[PDB]
Write a protein that binds this DNA or RNA. Structure first.
Lengths: 66, 66
DNA sequence: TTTTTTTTTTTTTT
């Protein structure tokens, strides 16, 4: 499943080799004319994603103040 | 501002060259004994961060179904 | 070999 968050950026959810990854990732268009994941991104495991969600309120507080 | 989401992973919030960035990134310990940002990570702008949050429910549903 | 916004490019450590 892919969830667009910008022009060339997605959160993607996939099973990779038995484990669920939540990937926040910029994509590019390659010379053969296909969409590929780029170097800018990180694949989170479910516990890291859970910790991120738990800190959204604090993250938002910091964003708001800048 | 730093928000830990794993042993060596953080969300950070900062103003860089006049732009607020929400960076999700893996860090490492370098040979001099200092923490440094690593190559696995992505800096979101606030609009991307807002779209990510908007889709957490859908992302979470994908995780349950994969 | 190691950041940082809408070419040379994936994939999990509290």
């Amino acid at each position: 499943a892919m969830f667009q968050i910008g022009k060339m950026r997605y959160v993607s959810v996939r099973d990779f080799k038995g484990k669920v990854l939540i990937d926040i990732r910029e994509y590019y268009m390659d010379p053969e004319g296909e969409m590929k994941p780029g170097r800018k991104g990180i694949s989170l495991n479910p516990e890291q994603w859970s910790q991120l969600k738990e800190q959204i309120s604090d993250i938002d507080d910091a964003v708001r103040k800048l």
